[PDB]
Design a protein around this ligand. Structure first.
Ligand SMILES: [K+]
Ligand SMILES: [K+]
Ligand SMILES: [K+]
Ligand SMILES: [K+]
Ligand SMILES: [Mg+2]
Length: 215
RNA sequence: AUAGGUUUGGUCCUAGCCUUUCUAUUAGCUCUUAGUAAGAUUACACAUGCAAGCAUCCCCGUUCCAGUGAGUUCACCCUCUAAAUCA
């Protein structure tokens, strides 16, 4: 009773049979989630649409991921991934930002319990790949605690709204290293041109930052 | 772009086209009030009226303002140095 189901896609797939010719089947993608991190998805197939809905709904609950939510409202860090030909680039956002993402990601996020996030889907906009990719990235996100333990260092959060106050969000449960992490003068990191282009005010889009209903 | 529709018996990939947003002109139909802003398609031809005077005569001004977008890297910086203002 805690879990809620929401349809993502309904497709009329067809095969050819010797006796009848075109045989119509229903392929249904559904996502189930209780809103507290536990969410899954499944594909249900049946000649009747009701049977397809049921099969997908009941099978999705046996394939539940657990999503680590930072402060139970957003992701811990920005996740960029490619699943097959679909690119999903998700950004961590502050409280009150909303779900500025593809309608399907909005639906899945509400089931997971993420309230604030931005995501841009590029490449193929296949619904199967998007869902499978979204759950792949969110499942693999590293929490602040896991980072502190791996690095043996404090994770200190700097917030602009709190000035210079150092907020320690995670500390290493084991021994704390005494050597500071080597500060590379120039980071050899791969930058997304779309990010850099926006930061330099070089991106004019009439469709970006349009006023939309509360999500 | 938070995207959407569309190739096929069907699936996936790629791809073009189109949809949704925001402005400006024109057309159809329709139209109550007030304030404000803006306002020939045409460097085609133009009836008529007006748009430059001032002032003890000399001078000064009419080389400005206003208009248009035909032509088109004459517009910017540096160097140098006329005219002009500082009786
Ligand atoms: K397309
Ligand atoms: K009209
Ligand atoms: K005079
Ligand atoms: K011109
Ligand atoms: Mg001189």
């Amino acid at each position: 009773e805690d879990f809620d189901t929401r349809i993502l896609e309904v497709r009329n797939v067809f095969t050819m049979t010797a006796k009848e010719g075109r045989k119509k089947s229903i392929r249904v993608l559904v996502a189930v989630g209780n809103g507290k991190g536990a969410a899954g998805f499944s594909i249900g197939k049946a000649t009747d649409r009701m049977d397809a809905f049921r099969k997908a709904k009941n099978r999705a609950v046996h394939h539940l991921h657990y999503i680590e939510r930072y402060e139970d409202h957003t992701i811990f860090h920005d996740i960029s991934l490619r699943f097959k030909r679909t690119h999903i680039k998700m950004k961590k956002q502050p409280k009150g930002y909303g779900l500025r993402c593809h309608r399907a990601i909005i639906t899945i996020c509400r089931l997971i319990g993420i309230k604030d996030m931005y995501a841009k889907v590029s490449g193929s906009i296949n619904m199967l790949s998007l869902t499978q990719g979204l759950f792949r990235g969110l499942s693999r996100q590293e929490t602040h605690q896991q980072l502190a333990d791996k690095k043996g260092l404090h994770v200190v959060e700097i917030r602009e709204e709190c000035g210079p106050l150092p907020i320690v969000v995670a500390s290493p449960r084991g021994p704390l290293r005494k050597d500071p992490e080597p500060e590379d003068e120039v980071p050899d990191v791969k930058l997304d041109w779309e990010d850099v282009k926006t930061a330099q005010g070089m991106k004019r889009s009439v469709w970006s930052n349009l006023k939309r209903a509360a999500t």
